[PDB]
Each structure stands twice: as structure tokens, then as C-alpha cells.
Amino acid sequence: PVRLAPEREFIKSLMAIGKRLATLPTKEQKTQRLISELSLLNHKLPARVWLPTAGFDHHVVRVPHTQAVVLNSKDKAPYLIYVEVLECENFDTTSVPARIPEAVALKEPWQEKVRRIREGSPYGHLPNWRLLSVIVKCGDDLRQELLAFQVLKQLQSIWEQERVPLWIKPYKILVISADSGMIEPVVNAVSIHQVKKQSQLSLLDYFLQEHGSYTTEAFLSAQRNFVQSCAGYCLVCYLLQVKDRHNGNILLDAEGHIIHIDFGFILSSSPRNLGFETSAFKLTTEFVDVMGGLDGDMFNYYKMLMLQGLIAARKHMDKVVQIVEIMQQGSQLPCFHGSSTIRNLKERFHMSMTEEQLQLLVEQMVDGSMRSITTKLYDGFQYLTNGIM
Ligand SMILES: [Mg+2]
């Protein structure tokens, strides 16, 4: 039978490492400790233990100790590890694999990292070898992240059911204690910040260079991916009221999708903004340009997807609300503030509106999301003065 004590000890071992990292002040010293800690871990591998974020049956065979990184200098600094596993068909009928004798991490292309680690590993030759990643957070409450994950998965199910081609990428969350857990990061994606820094290009010119020129299938495909993911995250950001959007917490993948990460401030999280914002989702000049501009066909597609996505969401509203209620009862998180949280969430599904009214609302919301475009300061004085322009 599959024993749970080995798994418990495995997970505990990852969390124990963090307490020892906390004894050191700088990220550099923490990283040095972490490498040594993971080296010890390999004494006990392979074993009948698994990474629950895998999503497929496997055994852990190795942790490439030199490849792990601590992410900051905080007392309970997150740390990122890579974990080698051997996939198996059926866990409970598979034997434990035999042991085989023996800044850049974030920017570096995933396929390059997989290549190097595979080359260095005694297990890298096996066809069922896979590389996983987790970020261990010993001092962060991840229950808000878990709630977001659950809601994001439900929206994907809803959009699939309603045949709306919105795209999002939920990332897996394990809640360990009330103030610790793990995350499976999104790989093969780079923050918008880093893409722009390394390339010194606008997003459009980056797309043109990386995917292809205007007349190419690759450009159009990438543009479509961008639009579908933009619309998906627009709706995520609105319905869950995700704050603190910037180019550090929006990632771009190799297919042209954007991916929002870090839902620290959702629903009734403090501080509530004072800027009369509908959402922290912003549509910048750069983003609109990737979509072919304000009069662009792909921008029109964006707006259509937003409408159809919202129609789909309200059609299945109870499936989302239930998730949030189940969490609110079981826990007591800072994203909740009494009974107004659920009321306000339901109100964002606009159940009283006709689809005609919803369409007008979407036009309004999209206009709002573009308010920080310089042109808006330039071209909206009719609302601020008795002039008609
Ligand atoms: Mg006026």
C-alpha cells in the first residue's frame, strides 16, 4: 500500500529548509544554504514520494541542488526548486525507481534549463524523466491564491462549456499551514518588464520580430493568443477585483499569451483604490497596438470576447459564487470583509441586465481600462469643462 508518512516527511523537509534559510540575512547566503540543504535531500531519493502539483503519477528521483534559487532577502524568503521525477502509468502498481549513482534562473529560457539539467542528471536519459518546479513559501498565506486558482479553473470550465475561446493559465497552489504553502510557477513565460528590457522593443515590434511580419500565420496566431488571454484576464481581474497590476506580474509566453500572476489583493483586499477604477486591468497603448489599434479588427474581437465571456460567466454565476462562499466560511482571510464581499461579487455579474445593456457596459469598461493612455488626458476635457471638446 501507498504510505503517507514518507510523503508527509518529504513535504515537511521542504518546509524545514525555510526555517534554516531564515537564520541568514542575504539572498546570497540563503541561496548557499539552500544548495547544501537540497544536497542532503538527495540522500533519501529516489523514494515513494511525489510532488502533488505534478498532476500525473510519478516518483521523485532527484533535486538538482545547484539549480535552486532563493527569491529575495526576506525573513521568510520564497525559494524556487527544480525536481526531477519519473512518470509512471499507475502509482500503486509501480515500484520505486532504482537509484543511479552521480537573475539568470528566472530569465533563462525553460527549454535551456531543461536541457542543462537533463544533461547533468543520472536520470536524464530515461524517457519518463520530467522536470517540475515549485516555489516554497514558508511564511505566506496562500489561501487567497488557492481561492483564485479554484475560481480560475471554474471560469475555464464555464468558457469551455459555452464555447467562448478565452484563454487563461491557472497555476497550482498547495496550502500547507495557514501561513505557508507551495506554488507551481508558470514556466516558458517571461514578465513583460523583462521582455521589454532585454529586447528594447515595443510589444508590437517584439511580436513582429519573434513571431513574424503582418502577413504571416505566426503573427496572426500570436495576436489571436494575445487577444484571447487579454480578454480572459480582463474578466478575471474584474470579477475577482485583482489589484496591483504591473509589468512584473504579467508574463508573456512563447505563443503570445499573457499570464497574470500574484493575486495578493483580490475582492475586498486593502487598500481599496481611491481612483474610481472598475478594475486594475489596464489596456495600455502598447497592448492596444499589439491588437491593431483602437479601430482594429483584433481589438473588436477582444471586445466581443469580453462580452461573450461575461455572458457565459453570468449564465454559470452560482458555480463561481459557491467556491468563494465555501472558502469564506472555512477560513477568515483579508480579502473578505463581512457579507458585502459576496454581494459585491454577485453584482459584478450584472444579472439584471439584458445582453444589449451588457454590451454597452463592456464598451464602458473597455473605455475605462484605457483611461491612463496619454490621449485620454488630451481628449476628454469635455467631461471636465463646459467646452464640447
Ligand atoms: Mg463639456
Author numbering: 304 to 405, 515 to 801
Quoted passage from the original study:
As a result, PI4KIIIβ is an appealing target for prevention of HRV-driven exacerbations in respiratory diseases. Inspired by the renaissance of covalent inhibition as a mechanism to target proteins of interest, this strategy was chosen for the development of inhibitors of PI4KIIIβ with a prolonged duration of action. The aim of this project was to develop a selective irreversible covalent inhibitor of PI4KIIIβ which targeted the conserved lysine (Lys549) in the ATP binding site.
Pleasingly, compound 4 covalently modified recombinant PI4KIIIβ protein. The mass shift after covalent labelling was consistent with addition of 4 minus the fluoride ion, correlating with attack of a nucleophilic residue onto the electrophilic sulfur atom and expelling a fluoride leaving group. To gain further evidence that compound 4 covalently labelled Lys549, protein X-ray crystallography was used to characterise the adduct. Electron density consistent with 4 forming a covalent bond with Lys549 was observed. The oxygen linker of the fluorosulfate group directed the warhead to interact with Lys549; it is possible that rotation about the fluorosulfate warhead was restricted due to a steric clash with the o-methoxy substituent. Compound 4 bound through a hinge binding interaction between the valine backbone amide and the nitrogen donor/acceptor atoms of the heterocyclic core. The measured KI was 29.8 nM which means the reversible interactions were favourable and a low concentration of 4 was required to achieve 50% inhibition. Despite this, the irreversible step, forming a covalent bond (described by kinact), was measured to be 1.17 × 10−4 s−1, which is orders of magnitude slower than literature precedent for a lipid kinase, thus, the rate of covalent bond formation was deemed to be slow.
